């Protein structure tokens, strides 16, 4: 029922060979819809999601992102005395809930630690420590950031979320069934059973092991839900059992693309 | 630990001689500079691509590297990760689906 | 976001 728009912005003094020092990745729900980086200097849609974008919209995104790049440059070249490389990060966006109400998000991190956040509902800032507190008091007193980001989060982000939901609706709604593989390896006297779910979309999934129809959570390991390059996902679960009992174990997979949960054996 | 947590997996369930994509996903690390190399029998794989830097809600960084490959029953496939938190390169072997 | 100085 609810939908989400999120931007992930990274500035780096040491991104590594051939890598851009500033990057933006935009997400609509569980899907990358566009990106920007300091080498191309262009904000560009993911065409498999947004196949018919107009240049006017992305001209605007490019100019806003280039402004973000300069701000991250400005900050990274101005860190207080508070060796090594440094990073700036920002995550912002909005939720539209099922009844149309809105939630905004806006948080910064320095060297990977919480730094400053902005809450649009109360128009207040939160500083994560006394150094951030200097920035918060300046931003509050200056009196302009709060109004700008109320607008950005509660109006611009919402408008763009609805646009990407409509323009990208074919990609967002197409369910992709997981291809499931179970296999076992006999290490010493232990038989390790693996259950991998390949290539599913949307992202949410569950994988559980069962023996004699009873779930077996105590000794299960899960690898997590991780991305494929094509916008589908991968997930895994493993369990260790005696080689004699390898036939009694079932991996149960639940996914929106599966009318009923699927059961798989070795 | 801000060291990378790494998983190696193929796009499709693996079968010898059928074209596929090998993935190496590193997550949970800081700083963002990282080297991730897909390898066949110890030799870097041709045509690898790298995701744009993004991060988790807890601020830790992550990156996917992938390359088309046709898995051979006779070869070993792995992902070599170098990161400032690791004294030496860490090599993560692909467990083939078969 | 102009945070520092
Ligand atoms: C100061 O806090 C910098 C704020 C930068 C805000 C705008 C970021 C870019 C929005 C468009 C991204 C397009 C590519 C995904
Ligand atoms: Cl650059
Ligand atoms: Cl099936
Ligand atoms: Cl089966
Ligand atoms: Na410093
Ligand atoms: Na099934």
Residue numbers in the entry:
A (entry chain A): 1 to 82, 87 to 270
B (entry chain B): 2 to 99
C (entry chain C): 1 to 5
Q: Could you pull the original sentences from the published paper?
A:
Here, using a mammalian recombinant expression system combined with mass spectrometry approaches, we identified N-myristoylated peptides as endogenous ligands for the chicken MHC-I-like protein YF1∗7.1. YF1∗7.1 exhibited the typical architecture of MHC-I and MHC-I-like molecules in which the heavy chain was composed of the α1-and α2-helices that formed the antigen binding groove and an α3-domain that was non-covalently associated with β2-microglobulin (β2m). The overall pattern observed for bound acylglycines and glycine lipopeptides was that the acyl chain, which is similar in all molecules, and was inserted into the A′-pocket, where it could promote anchoring and is protected from exposure to the aqueous exterior solvent by the A′-roof, a structural modification seen in human CD1 but not MHC I proteins.
As proof of concept, we then selected and synthesized 5-mer amino acid long peptides from teg-1 (GQAVS) and teg-2 (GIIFS) post myristoylation motif (GXXXS/T) to investigate their molecular presentation by the chicken YF1∗7.1. Next, both teg-1 and teg-2 peptides harbouring a C14:0 acyl chain were commercially synthesized, and YF1∗7.1 was refolded in vitro in the presence of the individually synthesized MDV-derived M-myristoylated peptide epitopes. The resultant YF1∗7.1-teg-1(C14:0) and YF1∗7.1-teg-2 (C14:0) binary complexes were purified using chromatographic procedures, crystallized, and their structure was determined to 2 Å and 1.8 Å resolution, respectively. In both binary complexes, the C14:0 acyl chain and the glycine residue adopted an overall position similar to that of the N-myristoyl-glycine (C14:0) within the A′-pocket, and the molecular contacts with YF1.7∗1 were largely conserved that included the three hydrogen bonds formed with Asp71, Asn75 and Tyr112. In the YF1∗7.1-C14:0-teg-2 structure, the P2-Ile was partially exposed to the surface by forming a hydrogen bond with Trp143 and establishing VDW interactions with Asp71, Trp74, Asn75, and Trp143. Similarly, the bulky hydrophobic P4-Phe was fully embedded within the F′-pocket and its main chain formed two hydrogen bonds with Trp74 and Asn75, whereas the side chain established VDW interactions with Trp74, Asn75, Arg78, Leu79, Pro80, and Phe119. Similar to the YF1∗7.1-C14:0-teg-1 complex, the C-terminal residue P5-Ser was exposed to the surface and engaged with Trp74 and Arg78 via VDW interactions. However, to accommodate the two distinct teg-1 and teg-2 lipopeptides, the F′-pocket of YF1∗7.1 exhibited structural malleability.
